[PDB]
Amino acid sequence: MEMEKEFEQIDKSGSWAAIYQDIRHEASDFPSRVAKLPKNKNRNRYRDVSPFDHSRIKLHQEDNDYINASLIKMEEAQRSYILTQGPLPNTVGHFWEMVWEQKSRGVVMLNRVMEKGSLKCAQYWPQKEEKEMIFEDTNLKLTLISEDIKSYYTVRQLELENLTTQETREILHFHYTTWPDFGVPESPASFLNFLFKVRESGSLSPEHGPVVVHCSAGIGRSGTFCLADTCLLLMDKRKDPSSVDIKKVLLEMRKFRMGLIQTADQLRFSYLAVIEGAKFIMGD
């Protein structure tokens, strides 16, 4: 069923809450035993948000291999994403270690460091060229190279150095800065513009490791980003784009990380973004 028609039908009936709860009821349930070990309590921002054991990213060290991060692998779309929480004061070094080990080109950030008067994630990147950051626990150095500030999003060029081998790589930081403190954006136009800037960079492409995507918990806004991307890619590959069922794509993605899309308003916004984006490239 064409999703645009399904959209108007849910909107006229006002059943967004009922559709959303059916998703929550059908979603996969897999064990998260590593996340709940007592040695890992200060590695988790939220007690109710854990990576499944089968899909979790492992750090390459014998000490403790645990990070709150999952590999979302879409088989038919041929895209991989890492979804993670906003780093904590004691996990900033783990975060950059993961970026290095997985060969990521891009980091996508969908939150501000402070929202609603509270800290949502650590200041994990340098703000001035001449004041670089050293993570002594993981032996990495991070330098700000350049910064391009726009109305809806900032792009930064960073240099990550493995202090052990003296290899360096360029990492692109894509920071969406205007998601509101409450609710979802009224129009998906600036979110879709941001997604197409990440794509154009090469960060989502198979010659690199998976893109690292985060918000505060790594399930809500982060979920919106990868669901919209995958749905538009499927519409460009399939003989009939109207076959693309966003609820079925979301359930597949929820086999890899719990809780993706946190509210009925985030679900509605995901439909809006896919419907509008399909036009962006629909003999347009």
Q: Is 6 in the site for ligand A1ABO (CB under 6 A)?
A: no
Closer CB to ligand A1ABO, residue 144 or residue 250?
Answer: 250
**Contact call for residue 161 and ligand A1ABO (CB under 6 A):** no
To the question of whether residue 218 is assigned a binding role by annotation, the answer is yes
For the beta carbon of residue 261, count every other beta carbon within 10 angstroms.
25
Q: Which is nearer to ligand A1ABO, 155 or 249 (CB)?
A: 249
Beta bridge partners of 116: none
Decide: 255 and 212 in contact? Cβ < 8 Å.
Answer: no
DSSP states of 48-105 as a string?
Answer: T----GGGEEEPS-SS--EEEEEEEEETTTTEEEEEEPPPPTTTHHHHHHHHHHHTBS
CB-closest chain residue to ligand A1ABO: 76
Residue 65 in tokens: 């291999």
Q: Does the footprint of ligand A1ABO cover residue 245 (CB under 6 A)? A: yes
Q: Does 250 bind ligand A1ABO (CB under 6 A)?
A: no
d(CA 202, CA 222): 19
Q: What is the largest CA-CA distance in the chain?
A: 60
Is 231 considered catalytic here? Answer: no
Judged by beta carbon, residue 169 or residue 255, the one nearer ligand A1ABO is: 255
Nearer CB in complex with ligand A1ABO: 7/152 = 7
With binding defined as CB under 6 A, does residue 274 bind ligand A1ABO?
Answer: no
Burial of 276 (0-12, 13-18, 19+ CB in 10 A): middle
Give least dist CB 255 to ligand A1ABO, A: 10
Q: Based on the shown chain and the rule CB under 6 A, indicate whether residue 76 belongs to the binding site for ligand A1ABO.
A: yes
Binding site for ligand A1ABO (CB under 6 A): 74-77, 230, 234, 245, 248-249, 252
